[PDB]
Structure 1
Amino acid sequence: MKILVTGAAGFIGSHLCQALLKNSAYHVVGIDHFIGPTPATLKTGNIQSLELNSRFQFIREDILNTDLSKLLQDIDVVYHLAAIPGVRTSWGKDFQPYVTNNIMVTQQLLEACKHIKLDKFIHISTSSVYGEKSGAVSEDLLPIPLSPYGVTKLSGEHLCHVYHKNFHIPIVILRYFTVYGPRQRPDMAFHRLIKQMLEDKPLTIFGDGTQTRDFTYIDDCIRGTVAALETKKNIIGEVINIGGKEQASILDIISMLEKISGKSATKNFLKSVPGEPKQTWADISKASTLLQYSPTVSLSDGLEAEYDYIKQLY
């Protein structure tokens, strides 16, 4: 089958392409405009192995300018990961690119899929739609985003439901929870903190560091994401959380990094970022039931993998 992966040069997209191309029966088309927080130099590094594979076609174009008829021709499955991520930079004049790349891109892809015969349109969304919630969050919970980023991602999901119900586009929504590992974007906490610790520079903590996340190792995320394509059971119209093995605070993470490096971190405590929840915590019962999803990578192992990646990168 032929699979389109949007945002194929990004953190998660590049890994997903690599995992799909392990199946010799799969051909992948990747499209990426090299925008968002990650410098082009890092994205080039993300796709260098992919571009050698004869079953990978790479298109460096904006989805809003590209020929979507040409892009979607004989596509069987769409993985839509293209987006602008980032809570802090989603305020004031920085908001327009979130609207353009998270809302308009999703509408224009879904429009182009109306007369195509897809098996699946697998739309990647975020735990950021939930906002500030207590306990493990299930997919039937009323989302109240806390950031403009989260609002634009939730509008994407809502467009998926619109095109599903009206035009029978076979949508599946995955909500990822803070993904980390090799190739993590340089604006995310583990990349920043590891880079800072390697350079013997202060570790930047937003707020007091007691905030927690459901951190999801990249190989766990990708196993869940591939399972959504490979299942034969009807998951069309479903929203599925994809979460991690072990939750932790930023202080817990820094302690674990200090154990890996054998260094002691200098900490700088900055003001809390408006729009960030204090806690995220997935209920992954539904992914367990529908996808046989079970995350298996510990934080200690995942963090050493990212630590090694960042050290080698710089």
Structure 2
Amino acid sequence: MNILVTGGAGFIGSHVVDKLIENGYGVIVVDNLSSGKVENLNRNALFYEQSIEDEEMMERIFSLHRPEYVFHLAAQASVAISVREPARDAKTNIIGSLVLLEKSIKYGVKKFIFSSTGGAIYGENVKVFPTPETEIPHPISPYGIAKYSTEMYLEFFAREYGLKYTVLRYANVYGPRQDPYGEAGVVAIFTERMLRGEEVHIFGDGEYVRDYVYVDDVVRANLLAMEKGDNEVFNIGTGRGTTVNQLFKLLKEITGYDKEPVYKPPRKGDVRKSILDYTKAKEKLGWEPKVSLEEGLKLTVEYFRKTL
């Protein structure tokens, strides 16, 4: 069986590719290497260094390989970049998604599994925590708006053509191979600086709460979504909130760092609190996180140590 993974040279995408290759699937990867890395690529997967926005190239790839599943992880996934360049962000995040969906219909993809966001989608005025999928989205960043837009388009393709889909709204994803710019980029920033004995900056009062989910658990959610959760949106998170101050403290103890953080003015657009309810994924996908924040951070620190 052929499977297409977009964004497969990236952080989460390369872990998804590895797992699929392990399980014996034929994997085709499309990635333009804008933020992904050649070193992340699996030598067993077929690789096209192309952009998902390129209609003629996507036409070619789908026509040759007719993937039965598409795991769509390719995105401009830095919130700050989306703010500085909203049109460019949307070209990748919305238009690129639409190109893939148009080809998916034309070439009979069975199911499309979309990586979306929980933290950037619910908005800044949520009252229910941990937050369920029944809360109406109110995204405030171009990245979150783009992701929500694409979720609506997915429902259109399902209604119009019968395409099956699953949307996975990840919480803050961290672990080996992550760069410092994604939704949990702070894990990498803190880890690399602490291991190098450099100064660490915290924005505002550090009391911003996030839901940190380990990459291996996110990968498992993707694979469970192959045969379960048709035409459903799922939060993928831990339901446990951690402040930046708490995260700093945990990484400090693990790394042996012995300096205090330096507090800086708050950044624009920083949502105060994000914690996801994964009850739905538990009930319908059979998914629960297996890796505690303590264990995940130790595995992450170990990866960065080896890099040094």
- TM-score using structure 2 length: 0.93
SS at match of 1:113: helix
1:273–1:88 distance in 2 versus 1, CA, 3 Å: farther
1:252-267 mapped onto 2 (5 Å cutoff):
252-267=246-261
The corresponding residue for 1:172 is 166
Counterpart residue number, 1:106: 97
Q: Deviations over 1:249-273 (max 9, x none)?
A: 1111111111112221331222222
Task: Report the AA paired with residue 110 of structure 2.
Answer: D
Rounded Cα–Cα distance in structure 2 between residues aligned with 1:89 and 1:129: 17
Unaligned 5+ segments in structure 1 are none
CA contact (8 A) 2:239 2:276 kept: no
1:64 pairs with one of 30, 53, 71: 53
- In the alignment, structure 1 residue 10 sits paired with structure 2 residue 10: yes
Alpha-carbon RMSD across the aligned residues, in angstroms, is 1.5
Alignment match, 2:222: 225
Which shifted more, 1-10 or 148-157? 148-157
Are the counterparts in 1 of residues 15 and 219 from structure 2 also a CA contact under 8 Å? yes
Q: CA deviation at 1:245?
A: 6.5
Distance 1:182 1:245 in 2: 22
1:125 & 1:16 partners in 2: Cα distance? 15
Instruction: Give the aligned residue type for 1:157.
Output: E
Distance 1:114 1:158 in 2: 16
Instruction: Write out aligned runs for 1:63-212 (5 A).
Output: 63-65=52-54, 67-73=57-63, 74-92=66-84, 94-127=85-118, 128-132=120-124, 133-134=126-127, 135-187=129-181, 188-212=185-209
> Structure 2: where are the runs of 5+ without partners?
none
Q: Deviations over 1:267-297 (max 9, x none)?
A: 1222222222111111111100111101011
3-state DSSP of counterpart to 1:236: coil
Residues 211 and 159 (structure 1 numbering): CA distance in 2 closer, same or farther, change over 3 Å? same
Q: Contact 1:201–1:266 at 8 Å: present in 2 too?
A: no
Identity of aligned residues (%): 33
Match status 1:21 vs 2:21? yes
Give structure 1 regions of 4+ aligned residues with deviation exceeding 4 angstroms.
none
Which segment is superposed worse, 12-21 or 145-154? 145-154
Where 1:129 maps in the other structure, the secondary structure is coil
Q: Deviations over 1:82-108 (max 9, x none)?
A: 11012222224x222211100110111
CA distance in 2, matches of 1:265, 1:76: 51
